[PDB]
Automatic annotation (TrEMBL), chain A:
The chain holds residues 2782 to 3400 of 3414 of the full protein. Homodimer. Interacts (via N-terminus) with host EXOC1 (via C-terminus); this interaction results in EXOC1 degradation through the proteasome degradation pathway. Forms a heterodimer with serine protease NS3. May form homooligomers. Zn(2+) 2 binds at H413, H415, C429, C547. Mg(2+) binds at D235, D365. It comes from Tick-borne encephalitis virus. This is Genome polyprotein. Signal peptide: none annotated. It is found in: Host cytoplasm, Host perinuclear region; Host endoplasmic reticulum membrane; Host nucleus; Secreted. Zn(2+) 1 binds at E159, H163, C168, C171. Residues 229-378 form the RdRp catalytic domain. May play a role in virus budding. Exerts cytotoxic effects by activating a mitochondrial apoptotic pathway through M ectodomain. May display a viroporin activity. Involved in immune evasion, pathogenesis and viral replication. Once cleaved off the polyprotein, is targeted to three destinations: the viral replication cycle, the plasma membrane and the extracellular compartment. Essential for viral replication. Required for formation of the replication complex and recruitment of other non-structural proteins to the ER-derived membrane structures. Excreted as a hexameric lipoparticle that plays a role against host immune response. Antagonizing the complement function. Binds to the host macrophages and dendritic cells.
Automatic annotation (TrEMBL), chain B:
Residues 229-378 form the RdRp catalytic domain. Mg(2+) binds at D235, D365. May play a role in virus budding. Exerts cytotoxic effects by activating a mitochondrial apoptotic pathway through M ectodomain. May display a viroporin activity. Zn(2+) 1 binds at E157, H161, C166, C169. It comes from Tick-borne encephalitis virus. This is Genome polyprotein.
């Protein structure tokens, strides 16, 4: 059994036995720090067998040999598999922090919301807005389809009216997301955090919301001009399962800045839906089919909440701001017991604004440039707050970097390139094998056209952000020469919230390049457009090979030669459509 | 010496001591779990020296210095060889399954037999049938069936079978081989299993009888589109020796779908010939000669029984339905000795028929695609029906595959291949050096230059038809066809697998037959435009060609494939003044 857990708030919500035909109670259930409330037969779904995108396979055949380009479809959407992941990574309980720590945390936290709030007040959001966002991309309906049928709104109206009263009956997680009705209720109460850009750099000081990968490098580089210690870029092992109750209570202080129906609407979401969670988890039944368990708990963050990104940013800002304090000397392990609160409030009054600009924080990822490297050893309040660092001993010093071009952020590194005309670019880089490998994974039942379109998405994206990788420019230019001109791209190419998506057009890819890298790039003073791909730079060849490029081997050499043969196969595969030749505009 | 013995159904059979001139009774015989009934002197036969095909050695001299083409040379057919193989692999007793296991077995089995009976009922097969097969014991079987004396012999043993006694159905273990009259008796009784295609995919669900090896890959790749776990392709260590008495009785309940003469002729074959075995095994005498032992046994299967494939398929379908059911929850190891029979009856009726289509079963070989990867730990009932997985610990978890292209089946992998015209092929593949090694083996001493040439053509055309996608094999196959006369018709078996079409034992143009099997008669090719020249048939990716053995790069080969025409000429001058065409030059 669990120790800390939900109580009477879960009742109205668990007490939809609308799967009553199959409701039962599996005494042999696995859950330990979650609370088992019953289960019901559900259609078994998921698979462990990998599906491979054929057009990307055809065009990138040396990547068969490579090993880390195949483990991306070592996935497992099967109940049995998902259950294993859950029992290893989700079913624990974070050690909540000691009471002094909690006092420092509330101090820093409330300081942060105060800052944020004075720029733009909390606010409710309109159905007409939810409509717009839906219209830009329990089951009686698409998403566009649902928001039209007034029966849908008549449903949210029912649950909304319940929330105003302070209960809800429908706001359950499918392990970790919800359905349109409750998703609108979130968006209404808390959607201001996203739509009013509370996690932007202007608002939160150290957030980076709204900056694409294509400009983030300028920010990394700007950090190197400050006085201080090394760049630090520790990562927290499994952030969402370490969001403690202290953490959640701190973020509920956002409620104070609201009033009226908005404060109520918000508080039900914040402390029923989010803090008294009711989760649907699939699990294999002992009779050849699939059961769904209903579990509850208090802490941890549901990864698919409407405002996970914002809250994780604000919360992680606070964690880093505290770590800064410990390392500077403002707090020490003593303060975990009887904290010197006036000491932290002075530091915020006197240095908070400056420390804010010393870090880039995007959800659970940071880059931190502290005033000196005492930050390495400053692990007490970090471990106390449960934000246990990945792949390092609990009390082992954090290792830093003096070259910003080596600091990892948002799954990337950033390098500076100088073009032929003397203008500098700072480009996002990533493992070539990691990027091809995700493109080789198919979302079955995807027709030759739908899979061609998904590939163009990857190819177009590679041209916006990894044009500086020989292998990828070639491979993206080939994909665009093998997929019809007017097939609009479709599909998810990245999950980062720094994805432009600017490549899901059917515009010329050079033309979008100039748009993002020059015309709209705020760091380009001169706005002279570039005319041909031959004038867009590359990384230095050493860097290319080192970030796992095939450049060098007979493999890559012979692949590059025979690559038109591949392109023609895909064309013949696709039929009598309009193709154009972008590969040859490599002076080839 | 044994503990599970035959009795009185052996006596009339072993009552041919009409080898009596030398019949005796070695007190120094080696049999533990077989029964000794007497030896008798025979002409010593068989060799352990490798006799290598002349023409294939001339045209592929690289592979001489290769301990992969000479591992096939070492086949010892001396009575001492046979004997040593026997004692190690065949003279054992499988542990018989537990009583509940046994119930579950007859439960699942009966489900299966009923299902196919309801689709086609057991029948007899006429002598017209048997005569027709033959067109395709002291000449050939073609002659043996025209002389009505051989047929009078049949009736003699036929009337004894109707009586319930066997005189001549005895196995030769050159555990099985038989003489014409006795084979017809088996064929007349049980031969519907073959002639009515009971192991057909359409009839058995999991079977693959009739699918050419050139088409199976479409079936493998189809499985990937199923929701489920990984692919599993455990291979059982020496299947036929683990076919237990349990297994045989279950098969025997096939008699409940016959009436009258049938149910007796068949009950005799199944219960006398198949289940009370009299086997002739050679062993070396102690006076410079051979002696044939006459031994008997209850269980195991003869490999050359007329319906070994069908019976083996069916019983394996049963074994694997049971293992799913262990790892699906339906069966819990505790009910090995007190069976929850109702569970397995529900599973069968509700889920069962869709489970049939997640397996590919061909004799003792399967590809299974379970509901989830619990199947990898479900080894209690698999170890209980004695079907021990080979090359892995008895309780060690199975290892799956996510990529259908990495799944092995019928001694082959399958890869997808896109042609220049854009159509897709799924070709079978196998280790190049095992393939050439088998051709380098001459089937007998005193084969003449003419007949060993004919046998090399048989291999060369087979390679051309199913392994055309290997650079080295296509060369070798084409060279062989250029060194052997055009009007010389291929002879001999080039493969024992039941999935061999044989379509290559023609003297027709190989491209012609290529197009007929890959396009014209190919059910998975919905465009029947034909291919004018070999230069248009695809290859396997050059990287995939050298991982799957091959030389390709290897200067040793570039030398070979340079002056291979020097070898063709040698073989021609060797053969004579005959009609030769130059198939090599239609290539690059
Ligand atoms: Mg990082
Ligand atoms: Mg196998
Ligand atoms: Zn609700
Ligand atoms: Zn890089
Ligand atoms: Zn007989
Ligand atoms: Zn292969």
């Amino acid at each position: 059994d669990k120790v800390k857990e939900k109580d009477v708030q879960e009742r109205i919500s668990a007490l939809r036995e609308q799967y009553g035909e199959t409701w039962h109670m599996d005494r042999e259930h696995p859950y330990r720090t979650w609370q088992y409330w019953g289960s019901y037969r559900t259609a078994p779904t998921g698979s462990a067998a990998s599906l491979i995108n054929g057009v990307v396979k055809l065009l990138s055949w040396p990547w068969n040999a490579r090993e880390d380009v195949v483990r991306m479809a070592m996935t497992d959407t099967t109940a049995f598999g998902q259950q294993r992941v859950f029992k290893e990574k989700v079913d624990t309980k974070a050690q909540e922090p000691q009471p002094g720590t909690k006092v420092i945390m509330r101090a820093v936290n409330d300081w942060i919301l105060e800052r944020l709030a004075r720029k733009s007040k909390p606010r409710m959001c309109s159905r007409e807005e939810f409509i717009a966002k839906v219209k830009s991309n329990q089951n009686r309906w698409s998403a566009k389809e649902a928001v039209e049928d007034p029966a849908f709104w008549q449903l949210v109206d029912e649950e909304r009216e319940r929330h105003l009263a302070g209960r809800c009956a429908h706001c359950v997680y499918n392990m970790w997301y919800m359905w349109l009705g409750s998703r609108f209720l979130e968006f209404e109460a808390l959607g201001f955090l996203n739509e009013d850009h509370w996690a932007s750099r202007g608002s939160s000081g150290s957030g980076v919301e709204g900056i694409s990968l294509n400009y983030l490098g300028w920010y990394l580089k700007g950090l190197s001009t400050l006085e201080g210690g090394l760049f630090y870029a520790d990562d927290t092992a499994g952030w969402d399962t370490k969001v403690t109750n202290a953490d959640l209570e701190d973020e509920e202080q956002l409620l104070r800045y609201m009033e009226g129906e908005h404060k109520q609407l918000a508080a039900t979401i914040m402390q029923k839906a989010y803090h008294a969670k009711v989760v649907k988890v699939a699990r294999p039944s002992r009779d050849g089919g699939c059961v769904m368990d209903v579990i509850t708990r208090r802490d941890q963050r549901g990864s698919g909440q409407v405002v996970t990104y914002a809250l994780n940013t604000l919360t992680n800002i606070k964690v880093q701001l505290i770590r800064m304090m410990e390392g500077e000397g403002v707090i020490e392990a003593s303060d975990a017991h009887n904290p010197r609160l006036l000491r932290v409030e002075r530091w915020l009054r006197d240095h908070g604004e400056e420390r804010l600009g010393r870090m880039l924080v995007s959800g659970d990822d940071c880059v931190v440039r502290p005033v000196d490297d005492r930050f390495s050893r400053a692990l007490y309040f970090l471990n106390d707050m449960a934000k246990t660092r990945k792949d390092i001993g609990e009390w082992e010093h954090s290792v830093g970097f003096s070259n910003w071009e080596e600091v990892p952020f948002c799954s990337h590194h950033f390098h500076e390139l100088v073009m032929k005309d003397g203008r500098a670019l700072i480009v996002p880089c990533r493992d070539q094998d990691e990027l091809v490998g995700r493109a080789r994974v198919s979302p079955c039942g995807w027709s030759v056209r739908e899979t061609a379109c998904l590939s163009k998405a990857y190819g177009q994206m590679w041209l916006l952000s990894y044009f500086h990788r020989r292998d990828l420019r070639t491979l993206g230019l080939a994909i665009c020469s093998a997929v019809p001109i007017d097939w609009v791209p479709t599909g998810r190419t990245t999950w980062s919230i720094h994805a432009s998506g600017a490549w899901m057009t059917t515009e010329d890819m050079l033309d979008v390049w100039n748009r993002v890298w020059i015309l709209d790039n705020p760091f380009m003073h001169s706005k002279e457009k570039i005319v041909e791909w031959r004038d867009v730079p590359y990384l230095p060849k050493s860097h290319d090979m080192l970030c796992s490029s095939l450049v060098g081997r007979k493999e890559r050499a012979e692949w590059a030669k025979n690559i038109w043969g591949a392109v023609e196969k895909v064309r013949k595969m696709i039929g009598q459509e309009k193709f154009k030749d972008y590969l040859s505009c490599m002076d080839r």
